[PDB]
Design a protein around this nucleic acid. Sequence first.
RNA 1: UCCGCGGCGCG
DNA 2: CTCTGAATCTCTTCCGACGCGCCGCGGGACGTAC
DNA 3: GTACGTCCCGGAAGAGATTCAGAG
Lengths: 1337, 603
Amino acid sequence: VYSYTEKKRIRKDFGKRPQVLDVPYLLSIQLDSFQKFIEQDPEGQYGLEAAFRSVFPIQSYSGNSELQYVSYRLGEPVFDVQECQIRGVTYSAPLRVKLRLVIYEREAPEGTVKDIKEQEVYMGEIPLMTDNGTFVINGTERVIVSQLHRSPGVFFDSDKGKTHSSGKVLYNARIIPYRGSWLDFEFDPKDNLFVRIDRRRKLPATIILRALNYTTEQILDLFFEKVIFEIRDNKLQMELVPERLRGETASFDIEANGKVYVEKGRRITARHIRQLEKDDVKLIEVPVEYIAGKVVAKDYIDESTGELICAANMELSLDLLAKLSQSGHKRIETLFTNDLDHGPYISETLRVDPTNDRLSALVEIYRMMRPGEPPTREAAESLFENLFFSEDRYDLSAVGRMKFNRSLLREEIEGSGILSKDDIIDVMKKLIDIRNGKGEVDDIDHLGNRRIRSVGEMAENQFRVGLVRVERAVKERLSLGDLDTLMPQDMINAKPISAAVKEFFGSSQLSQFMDQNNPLSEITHKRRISALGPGGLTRERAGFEVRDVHPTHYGRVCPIETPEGPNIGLINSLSVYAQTNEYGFLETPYRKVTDGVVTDEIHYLSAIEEGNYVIAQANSNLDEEGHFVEDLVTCRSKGESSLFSRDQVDYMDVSTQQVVSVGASLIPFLEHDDANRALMGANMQRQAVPTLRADKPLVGTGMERAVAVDSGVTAVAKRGGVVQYVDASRIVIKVNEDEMYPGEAGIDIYNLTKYTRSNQNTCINQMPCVSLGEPVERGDVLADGPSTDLGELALGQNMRVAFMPWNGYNFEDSILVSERVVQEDRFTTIHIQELACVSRDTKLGPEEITADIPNVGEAALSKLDESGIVYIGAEVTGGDILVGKVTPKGETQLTPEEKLLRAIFGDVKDSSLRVPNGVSGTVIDVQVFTRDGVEKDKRALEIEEMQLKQAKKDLSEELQILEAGLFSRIRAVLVAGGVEAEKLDKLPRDRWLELGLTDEEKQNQLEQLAEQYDELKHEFEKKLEAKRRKITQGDDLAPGVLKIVKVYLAVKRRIQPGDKMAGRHGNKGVISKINPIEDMPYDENGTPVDIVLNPLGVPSRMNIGQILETHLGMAAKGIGDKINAMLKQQQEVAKLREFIQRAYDLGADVRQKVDLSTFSDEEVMRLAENLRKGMPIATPVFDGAKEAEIKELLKLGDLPTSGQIRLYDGRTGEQFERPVTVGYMYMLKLNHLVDDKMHARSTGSYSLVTQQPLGGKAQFGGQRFGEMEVWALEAYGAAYTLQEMLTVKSDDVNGRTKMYKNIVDGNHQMEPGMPESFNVLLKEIRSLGINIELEDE
Amino acid sequence: VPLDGGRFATSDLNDLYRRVINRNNRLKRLLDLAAPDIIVRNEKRMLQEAVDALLDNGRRGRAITGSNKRPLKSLADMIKGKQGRFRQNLLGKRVDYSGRSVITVGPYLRLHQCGLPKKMALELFKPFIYGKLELRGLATTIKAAKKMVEREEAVVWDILDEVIREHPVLLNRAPTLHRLGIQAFEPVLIEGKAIQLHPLVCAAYNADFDGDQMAVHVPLTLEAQLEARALMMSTNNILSPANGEPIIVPSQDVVLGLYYMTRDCVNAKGEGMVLTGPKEAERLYRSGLASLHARVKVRITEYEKDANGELVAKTSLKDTTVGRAILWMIVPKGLPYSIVNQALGKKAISKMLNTCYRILGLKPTVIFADQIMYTGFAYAARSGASVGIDDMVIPEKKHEIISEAEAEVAEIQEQFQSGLVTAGERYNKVIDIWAAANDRVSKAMMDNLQTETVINRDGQEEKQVSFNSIYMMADSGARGSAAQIRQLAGMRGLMAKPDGSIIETPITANFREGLNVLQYFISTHGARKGLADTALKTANSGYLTRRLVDVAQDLVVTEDDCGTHEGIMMTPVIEGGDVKEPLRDRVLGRVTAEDVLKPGTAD
RNA sequence: UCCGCGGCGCG
DNA sequence: CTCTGAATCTCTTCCGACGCGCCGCGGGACGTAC
DNA sequence: GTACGTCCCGGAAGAGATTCAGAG
Ligand SMILES: [Mg+2]
């Protein structure tokens, strides 16, 4: 079962594993992120309305005035997209908000407000999303990349080893809020608790606890358990629990009930513990020396004297024991403090602190926060209540609260945005337990601790910044308010929010420039995960663990695609099936398996809960019932790989394609290739160039259809129907009967995009691929874009290739190309350049653009009109003039005597645009921008008349076609219920309203048709008026410029020795020499080969997949030429039908199972004709074809089975003694031309700071001689050349003038002098107080 | 500098000067009215902070800032670092009369000359063209010269050809590493838009042809030309400045061709004949009547220099191969015949070239070098060594070896479930058994690939060395080693995880067959680790090289003989096993300190 | 206008 | 108990490769009159 | 709206504070 346009060219596919979930909407991240920010979200959640409800409601300083929020609405954009990129204005829309201001009277704060006022006010402008998912800021399209940042919540790092150089690992626990000040705890070699705030100086931990209204006894009770001592009449009896004696050191004989249990000098045994549990011993006698190390917790005060006997947290002594015993105390409570079970960290920290008063703690905090300021109670209280417990400055997000709760094993996963005392005390307790040895540390690289942002979140954050700025502004303005004498628009201003949004969208580390020259390039650019940006890492502070891939990266982020160089592993790309969870984590699909049956329903798993379960591999065979054919299947439980039983798994992979990203998944035979060359080949594939005539790729992956459809490049059909009128400019579709709306059905109209400037100086064009009378179905390709063909993705071309070393012209990686390749004109690429001329305003008068130019003759003016603008179609080369632009420098200072002196022997001067030297081409379009109030020349009038004619003819044709279809629909409806074959159309269709007929659904349907006809004609008149007014008016430009002339050159670039060509496996190389056709080797059949590679690279660069690809291409052409031979003779359809059927079965159990008995004879004839150029073959990434299928398919053809064919030589003409390999490989052209890096300079401009030549190519400069270059020259005996080169040719001015004069005279002699850059250093170092000078000669 | 618009892009120094002078003027004004001490002290402290900021910004806390956040620069910042004068504008400065492009091969050139594109040829040498044109008197002024050079008539190309005949130029690679990073050639005009560079030089530059860019320079004055002609040719750099081995060693292709040249097979057409001299061996070979490599007895007349500077002519009948005679056609007179009787790999040819240089002089060495390069390309092209997909024969015992290893690991695991073994020792044991299986399968694959060929020898049967394309390409020494062929044919062994330990499951699939997903995923770890390491290591090495080079800048040899008697005792190193380096490669090229005494003491 | 900052890319 | 006093711990600075090619933004604000 | 005045991450190394070790 296939649709009609899939019947044009069916792609044979291998494979055995049946897929269950097709590729989703591949461009979903940007769209589903942005369809939350500009949406009217009811009741408020993660949107603009939430931001307003968060910041907007404001109450003045008891001024009885309040500014609340009501609603918002976005108006229609002023300009469409096309006008936006053609002019230069942002594709934005106004943001209307309804605001309420209330002012109350006296004596009551809570009652009903006396007076209100409501109105609509304007504020800011928001950039929109085009349907391609991209942004237009300033005449330049730009793309936003999603950012990967550090997840909010509590985390336990460890800092292995490095600190203190002693092997004692420390432990820190930092809390990273979503917005606010940080907070972290850590240890010391002294084993103390320390608090730090925003990396400032170290403070003890107990200060916060004391400031939170906790007494010392409360702290000790919370952080430690309790033990009781009871002073009986003899030896201070003690209450005992047997389970606490694990690992404690004994000091005497433990006995109970008059029975000895533990021997003096020995330690407890497990059997002794069992015995103690058997006897339920509770109270034991204790010697006085056993209490020689316990510390009191709470204070004891004498009732009689009224003093303090023992203070909190100090060790007791014998004298203190006697005092407390004689004071009448019976219950004595102290600490546990074992060596291994519970460290006395809290006790020693409370000992080491200098202060023990909450007001003192607040004083310490206040002085720490703001040094050098007298503290006071109110300021400290406010500051502490505002740092952590204020809604304005500290706020955890819902994700932050969820993770914070999860890491502490609480129950309710919902809470407020601020923290509380329970949270901090639980964090301290968890840290103590982690130090104690229970629990485990948490690593960072795990994807369960990382979060992805997108456009919406960052836009909301910047917008909130703008609103907080305007909020403090309106507060300070309302603090001096008045009784509604002003209307609520003065306080609100469009400066701050607009400035913030413009700076974010224009100048940010994540609003990066679009790099588009291929559909794949944009399919892989918008799906990018950058680890840089605000709030993220920096390039120079990235270690190795952040670059290496964690074993939890399987199926979420690509492991093999990343830009090589300074930043590897930070620009990783998202996978194919991967999505975004609601909170923001990454997840991938899976299949839930029952005990024996693999159910087809899909479950989503995040990056945390997957480790608990066990996951089987995708590439495991299975039966029709889902039972695993083996009793053991390899799986992964916790980052490992092992073997498990028949029934212990709970989830299954969806398909074998989910491990890679879209960038590298297009490389056939990937599983036979090394990772390095796969990465390189993906990088070259990302950076191809459009070709003049695309050709289908012979060996594909069966995925090109999705990547071609989902990119914003192909005009995919919206609603099904049949084509009615096709043209190189527009396409019209007649709608089918089952897909019409009840009203205003009509027919669809499209508009192709012709030759226009691209963004990377390439050319994007659209050619219609649909015939006439060909019906179409919904969601189908009609006209292909650049590097596309019939809905497939065709980057380069396929050519016959052969492997051998040939006379050294393919020495190490060079390639030789026969003249046949350029003969067929199949590597020509089109490049479009934009040249601008500005008409600024300077002193002494403005400049003139007329053609009146002196110092040149008819040779330089034959290509110009009267206005001074080149005609359209004038073949221009290097050395002509495009616009005659002259600057009147002036200062003529005419004199009756001295001026005629200049004319005795033998003002405004030219500043016209100059063609780049070396590039030919033809001008295609000239566009002019003029400031309003300036006289337009003749050419501007003609151009605007041309636009008016084009617009009016377009609208007229649109009305003509639309109403023709409308009246055809009227006729079709009228065919039933009172039809008049000829009586209806005696007089033209303009009057079909006075028709006498019965009133039914048809009659009022026609009435509705006429009503919408009238409405349409009115609306078309209105918008024709609006459009002509819009196009006739002038346009705003930059300040100070008079007019702008835009001219487009269109150079056609051929192939030439120096260009870079590369395959799809990383075997790049630059072509070396072009050869006549006779010289390349030819086979016995007679056909010559086209490209000869270098076989030497295969051992080292172990990319064995290229050989397999070559053999597969040979097989494809072996089928294709056989079809060609069968087609050239006018043979009947049965033989070709059976041949194609045999070609399609040709293998083991596959998923295609196509049949030809359901094809029309015309359809199969067209399929055969379109298949004459070879058979495309689809191969999955990790489910490809083995060797046996290749051998069998070659056996289907007459080609040799071994894959090596004997070959002859062209020069000498004898057989090679060893046969070689030939076949068809997909060869690409990269965007590194040779006429872009070639450069030379004799003597150009000089800089001003130091008289040295400039740098770069656009600036006419020369190359740089570095310091290592100087060392290399010094390593020889080189003396004169070094001095000469860095003295005369570079710095000295008199020296180089003298050298020039001498060279033009035929002598060669040098005067060194002294370089002036050293003189610059002299002056600069003299600019300080240092006395630098040069002594005698 | 005024830019496009009504605003002026002010420099940081100007703003700092304005601030300091404004504060000074305000303080001068304030003291006139005898202000209270507090305010004048406060403004003085402001002035002092400002002048410190101007003199050195960022040394004190709260560094001043400019437009939005970037700290403004100062003179101290203008001297330091890569953005300062010393290391960016004084030691290395941009020079005119230069150009750059991409490189191609053009293997038909001789090694003392290089190609150069026409456009750069016209653009670089414009002053010379002007001088010659004025001497020949085709222009009264310079403006006519301007029109003629910009119009490039037919009268200027002959002049350009005349001025280039003997004018050396310099080539350069951007990340220059050693003293061979700069060399001079004799340019030869060529069409196109790229520079052709001789392939044999390409080994010295460590430059492939994947888009490398070379920068050209012109020595202008007369002494520069003479110095470049005396020291800067490739002909005067035949030995490395780091070691005594030649640096013009054949790299990749010619070595492969020559290794194909000499490997006699037991049976080929044309066996058992006698030839007069090498000059007719080619006559037989090119007529198709004798195979390229076959046993044959020929007469060879080599010249040897046992006598005092004169060459001795001796003749004999040597048993050799036809290809060896064809190569004997190209050897100079000095070398004895016993040097081309072996397989003639890469080390052998390097040593042979070295001894040719050591014995015969200099000029015959360079002539032999470029001639051998020509003939190597020619015969490698004739051979046509192509890699095929059936050329990788998998050993048939691999499956049974894997089965045995899996049975052993299964029984070890079962013993682990018996509670008799710990974790670390079984870990080490399974690693050991996997290593044993790896080396065993590697040995089996090497054994059944390197000598699989068997021939009837015109008799019953005989076993000879194999002519497999991949084995021949890997054993020559052109590119590859045992590790790469082992990885490509046998199982790849044990990969490591970022923790540094070894994953318990080896990869039991070679590149010829398929790979499972996790097997690829594990190797991704090593690939990424290697790429990151090679990214950072070059950055470290550059800084280390600069630190070494700055300190030894001033040591220049100035005297011919100090005249001392103190030396260091030199002995070969013995680590505790076989000798690593003998006296031959450690004492060579040094002067004796004390007289060497034979164990015939007092001799 | 020749400079600075930022991003991307190739050796 | 007291004085050195050598040893130790902690705070502050400098340093991290070298050639290119493409593109985009940049004295801005804040008030004072004109 | 605009011209104009004022303004604004290790790693290595050393210097300095601490410390406690031990002799007098
Ligand atoms: Mg390279």
